[PDB]
Design a protein around this ligand. Sequence first.
Ligand code: MG
Ligand code: MG
Ligand code: MG
Ligand code: MG
Ligand code: MG
Ligand code: MG
Ligand code: MG
Ligand code: MG
Ligand code: MG
Ligand code: MG
Ligand code: MG
Ligand code: MG
Ligand code: MG
Ligand code: MG
Ligand code: MG
Ligand code: MG
Ligand code: MG
Ligand code: MG
Ligand code: MG
Ligand code: MG
Ligand code: MG
Ligand code: MG
Ligand code: MG
Ligand code: MG
Ligand code: MG
Ligand code: MG
Ligand code: MG
Ligand code: MG
Ligand code: MG
Ligand code: MG
Ligand code: MG
Ligand code: MG
Ligand code: MG
Ligand code: MG
Ligand code: MG
Ligand code: MG
Ligand code: MG
Ligand code: MG
Ligand code: MG
Ligand code: MG
Ligand code: MG
Ligand code: MG
Ligand code: MG
Ligand code: MG
Ligand code: MG
Ligand code: MG
Ligand code: MG
Ligand code: MG
Ligand code: MG
Ligand code: MG
Ligand code: MG
Ligand code: MG
Ligand code: MG
Ligand code: MG
Ligand code: MG
Ligand code: MG
Ligand code: MG
Ligand code: MG
Ligand code: MG
Lengths: 274, 47
Amino acid sequence: AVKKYKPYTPSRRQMTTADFSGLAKKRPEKALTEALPKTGGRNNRGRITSRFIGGGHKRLYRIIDFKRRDKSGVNAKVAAIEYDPNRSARIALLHYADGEKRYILAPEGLTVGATVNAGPEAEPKLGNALPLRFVPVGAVVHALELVPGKGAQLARSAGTSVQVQGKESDYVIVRLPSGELRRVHSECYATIGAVGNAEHKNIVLGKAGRSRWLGRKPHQRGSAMNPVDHPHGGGEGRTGAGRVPVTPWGKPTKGLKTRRKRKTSDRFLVTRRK
Amino acid sequence: MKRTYQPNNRKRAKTHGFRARMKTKSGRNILARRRAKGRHQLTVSDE
RNA sequence: AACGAUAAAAGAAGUGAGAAUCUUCUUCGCCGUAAGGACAAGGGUUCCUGGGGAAGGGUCGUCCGCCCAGGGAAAGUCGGGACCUAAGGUGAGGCCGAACGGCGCAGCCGAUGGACAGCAGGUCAAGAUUCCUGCACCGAUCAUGUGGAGUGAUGGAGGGACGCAUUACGCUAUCCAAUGCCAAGCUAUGGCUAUGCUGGUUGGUACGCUCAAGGGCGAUCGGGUCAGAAAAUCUACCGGUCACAUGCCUCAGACGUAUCGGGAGCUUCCUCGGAAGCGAAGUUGGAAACGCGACGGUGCCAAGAAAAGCUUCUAAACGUUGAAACAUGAUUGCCCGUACCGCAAACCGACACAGGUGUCCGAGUGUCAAUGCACUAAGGCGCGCGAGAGAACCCUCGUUAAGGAACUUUGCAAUCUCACCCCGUAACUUCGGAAGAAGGGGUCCCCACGCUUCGCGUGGGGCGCAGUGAAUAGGCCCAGGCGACUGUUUACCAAAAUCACAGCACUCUGCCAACACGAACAGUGGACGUAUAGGGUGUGACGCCUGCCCGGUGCCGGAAGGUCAAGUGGAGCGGUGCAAGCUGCGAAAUGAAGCCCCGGUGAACGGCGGCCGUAACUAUAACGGUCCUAAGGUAGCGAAAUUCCUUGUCGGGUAAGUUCCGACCUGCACGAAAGGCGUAACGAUCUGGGCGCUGUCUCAACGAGGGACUCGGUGAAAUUGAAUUGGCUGUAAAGAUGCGGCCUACCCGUAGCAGGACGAAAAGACCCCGUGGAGCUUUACUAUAGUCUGGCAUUGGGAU
RNA sequence: CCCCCGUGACAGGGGGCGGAGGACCGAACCGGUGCCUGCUGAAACAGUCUCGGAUGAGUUGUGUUUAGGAGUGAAAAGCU
RNA sequence: GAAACGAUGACUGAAUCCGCGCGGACCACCGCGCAAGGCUAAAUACUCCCAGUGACCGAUAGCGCAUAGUACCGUGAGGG
Ligand SMILES: [Mg+2]
Ligand SMILES: [Mg+2]
Ligand SMILES: [Mg+2]
Ligand SMILES: [Mg+2]
Ligand SMILES: [Mg+2]
Ligand SMILES: [Mg+2]
Ligand SMILES: [Mg+2]
Ligand SMILES: [Mg+2]
Ligand SMILES: [Mg+2]
Ligand SMILES: [Mg+2]
Ligand SMILES: [Mg+2]
Ligand SMILES: [Mg+2]
Ligand SMILES: [Mg+2]
Ligand SMILES: [Mg+2]
Ligand SMILES: [Mg+2]
Ligand SMILES: [Mg+2]
Ligand SMILES: [Mg+2]
Ligand SMILES: [Mg+2]
Ligand SMILES: [Mg+2]
Ligand SMILES: [Mg+2]
Ligand SMILES: [Mg+2]
Ligand SMILES: [Mg+2]
Ligand SMILES: [Mg+2]
Ligand SMILES: [Mg+2]
Ligand SMILES: [Mg+2]
Ligand SMILES: [Mg+2]
Ligand SMILES: [Mg+2]
Ligand SMILES: [Mg+2]
Ligand SMILES: [Mg+2]
Ligand SMILES: [Mg+2]
Ligand SMILES: [Mg+2]
Ligand SMILES: [Mg+2]
Ligand SMILES: [Mg+2]
Ligand SMILES: [Mg+2]
Ligand SMILES: [Mg+2]
Ligand SMILES: [Mg+2]
Ligand SMILES: [Mg+2]
Ligand SMILES: [Mg+2]
Ligand SMILES: [Mg+2]
Ligand SMILES: [Mg+2]
Ligand SMILES: [Mg+2]
Ligand SMILES: [Mg+2]
Ligand SMILES: [Mg+2]
Ligand SMILES: [Mg+2]
Ligand SMILES: [Mg+2]
Ligand SMILES: [Mg+2]
Ligand SMILES: [Mg+2]
Ligand SMILES: [Mg+2]
Ligand SMILES: [Mg+2]
Ligand SMILES: [Mg+2]
Ligand SMILES: [Mg+2]
Ligand SMILES: [Mg+2]
Ligand SMILES: [Mg+2]
Ligand SMILES: [Mg+2]
Ligand SMILES: [Mg+2]
Ligand SMILES: [Mg+2]
Ligand SMILES: [Mg+2]
Ligand SMILES: [Mg+2]
Ligand SMILES: [Mg+2]
């Protein structure tokens, strides 16, 4: 489920580790293994836009086509469930009966070797490419596009499930994992099931290092900084605030709606993530 | 302890040189505004 | 004053105008995971020869890294380019932007990497996988042949192609042993006369049915069109079929044989010492890599660059009587870099400077091992002032009678302790730990005996004060405060209680995501991530927990109404000309967000408090406690990092305790994620006590080394009105050597002291002043990026 | 992983074997904990002795990117 | 400010002769004028350079220089 550790070192107690005992051990396919360099958070101007990014371990991209519509109407069989360091989830290896291999995202349960399909003409099985309209009411799914062909941008993190509330017009209502209700153009695609990994959410990190190894340079209380540096700075003691909680940029954190008030999305969200 | 100036030929040239100084406007400007002061030392290319 | 580390020098010989310093010789002293050797970066002729001596050299110099002149550096195979790509930099068209310009796909530049054909020896005063000798390899073009029909890209696939840690067998380097083999001479000073002493003991290439651990490894037929634009002997899926052990395959390496070298020395000539010829052996045994066999095995989560060369298919295309492939001969071999210094006197430090500088090699003995310590080898030095003295004082070090923390701000400093083995080891605990707790005992030499060795246990003997005998080598414990922890921090006065952290919590964010850089509808990070994600904020393991106040501020939500800008609408007012008329001004209603207003919200901002009376002179050590704002402290803590009164009161320890520990509660002024209270472990943190040890101390002494002092050599500094510069009392702008009076005092210097010269150093950094400045702050003022918002333009048809 | 020992509602306990770790002692390397010396230094920040990490958040070479109300900062207004 | 006029950024974009524009709000009168198309020597400014002069300097003057942007400092711009 998760490996644990006897307390032989101080930090080797709470520490916890994944269960990769179901990972088809394999060096990911060569003609699918692009090269990701890291970006300190600096952009093409060399200034840290994102903030607090740094190093960790060398990583590579595995192309994971999300629009299965490039090969729907035929099926492939699962070949392996290797380990991507860039995703919160696990990924799986597709052997299309007609030669071409691909990589797709791996869902919850889907045992190594199950032969899965793609096309509107597909059984609600785990791992099928299926349009959202042909999906049963109340069914469990992930990997949802905001338009046909675009690419699956919904339900991708570990153990996530967008849930078909049901059809309507040509826009199917949907339950986002955040707790939101979204209209989706029924010619949008889907992949049946929960994401899996699932266990992820729970692995205790355990020590500084473990943060570093995923490349998350140490985070910083502005309450450390000085006036010159950032808002909450100054003081003579472990000091409070003296103003309302606020980002470095002074635009309040803690209870301040930040979404842009006018938008085109505003007539596709029937409810709010509350 | 250890000092400010640790020479690096490639650095020196790729930093202060002539292809470099001409690559930018303000370096053209540095150039001719040097020339006027009768520099023999035009540029670290001329070392 | 200083001559730049306390690694150390002597005598002889020589040269010269002159020598402690330069050159020979013989010793001595220091380095030896270096203070040796080889590179890179940097420097630039510092290299070698011959010469010079003004200045550079911390003295001297006849000498030099300085001066002069002349020489020296050689590559198809090393390194870079003629090949490749990473980050990054670029970049026609392309996307933007007051200008200059900012972006940006392909392509191109870009080594720190990929790729890649040569090794062994010899020698100039000075080069060396270059030159020379010996034997190789690679590409290129031609020719005689085997030719005798296919060649195989600007696209396809394969391959190149990669992490950390641990580890099995084989082996090389390379080092040790010896009555192995070869060579050399000798008898020392009592002995040894060799079974002693010293030295050397295989490098390349070629073959060879010789030995070999290790390592990679399948194959062929067919189907599917729909996979690689298409093609397709290929590559990928599906299926069938094939003697599991394997053989197929490779050969690090060793053994043999041969050949080319090299080899201790030996000889011969001879000119501050070299030129030239010659040449023996080639053994058994053991150790052993971070190297090779290798892209081996296993385990692990943090999941490990790209591209060309390369290998395979096909497209066009010209060929299919000259297509590839091959053997051999010819022939060809571009471009820069190669000297020398390169852990330093030659680079960076202004210096021939106790600093800084990246990778490799880095022998032996002793030592559990080792790049550790002592001593050494090869090699490299004795650090470019010397000599004597043997006072104060100063630095670094030894020893110490009696005592043993009496020192003191504090055991600061310094001693103790010290390795390996064997016995043994506490509260407390998160069951890992504390822990090397504590505390003991052993350790050397010989003989016998056993055992798995170099090795070790056992038994008996031996010696000295002592046997990790020299060097490298933990003092320990009890009890608190703070943080949990490993980490981080103020380059050059603060290393912690800071900060980070794993953990938890509030919110924000549904993708052209928020958020952030931005001439800007560019492009970028966020992210090739997707709510188990991303941002921001706060607390800071873990454990039991985290209460009371929504009135003010903030925030979320609400809508009746109060409202509010431009714009819409203009009744009415007036200026004017005779005038149609032009026009100045401008009211109603309507009208955006936002504020007023209603409620919700604390792991948002915050809040969780005022007071009552005492005999006397306008007063001091003390009182028990009812309690106005929205509420007025729940747990736990409490004289604390918080305590005013203050050395609070009590207890412990002490002979004696403002400190410390426990309790007490009257908390000036603790309190729950600005966390509350705990807690094992961790700590160059902080605080008190102990044991041990000690010159920290009583109280200092003797000794040593480097200074200080003397002599010969070179010779600074900050300061400086000018001085021919006493003391006491007094006076003076109030601290007098200079004025008064009185005392005292012959001229000069040397080593020493630090009272004075309000001593030197920086126009005081505290304080006041300046309608001086800069940083920072907010509900001080004003704008303003940004951002919300109505109208207007992009901006269109229609249905009701 | 592998054996024997254990069955009160109980994860367990011994032995083998294994090689884990912001484990430990400790050179190189990285850092500056205390004292003294140095303060017209040997050096515009160091020397000796002592001390901290020493497979990790480690150390370092090379090419390269970000800058002035700007960068960068495990936060000192430090560093540029 | 009574704000004429030109001038443009965004919205609007009239008359062409019995017409258009101005005369410092605005109106009549009465005057000066031809927007929406272009070129144009001359006088004027400067002085790296050439020459002539001087109640300008003569070696701390005079340019920074009797010459040198060199020596020297600076990673650089730059100082000199
Ligand atoms: Mg945090
Ligand atoms: Mg601070
Ligand atoms: Mg401060
Ligand atoms: Mg601020
Ligand atoms: Mg503040
Ligand atoms: Mg002296
Ligand atoms: Mg000296
Ligand atoms: Mg001496
Ligand atoms: Mg002689
Ligand atoms: Mg003579
Ligand atoms: Mg000498
Ligand atoms: Mg060396
Ligand atoms: Mg010489
Ligand atoms: Mg001299
Ligand atoms: Mg002579
Ligand atoms: Mg560019
Ligand atoms: Mg290279
Ligand atoms: Mg090569
Ligand atoms: Mg090469
Ligand atoms: Mg050759
Ligand atoms: Mg081995
Ligand atoms: Mg012998
Ligand atoms: Mg004798
Ligand atoms: Mg011998
Ligand atoms: Mg290319
Ligand atoms: Mg050279
Ligand atoms: Mg010297
Ligand atoms: Mg030096
Ligand atoms: Mg070695
Ligand atoms: Mg050794
Ligand atoms: Mg040593
Ligand atoms: Mg030398
Ligand atoms: Mg005498
Ligand atoms: Mg004594
Ligand atoms: Mg005694
Ligand atoms: Mg001490
Ligand atoms: Mg125990
Ligand atoms: Mg012990
Ligand atoms: Mg005895
Ligand atoms: Mg004994
Ligand atoms: Mg010690
Ligand atoms: Mg700490
Ligand atoms: Mg400091
Ligand atoms: Mg310090
Ligand atoms: Mg409103
Ligand atoms: Mg008491
Ligand atoms: Mg705290
Ligand atoms: Mg620490
Ligand atoms: Mg005491
Ligand atoms: Mg003298
Ligand atoms: Mg007088
Ligand atoms: Mg007098
Ligand atoms: Mg003195
Ligand atoms: Mg002053
Ligand atoms: Mg460690
Ligand atoms: Mg540091
Ligand atoms: Mg106008
Ligand atoms: Mg003169
Ligand atoms: Mg002059």
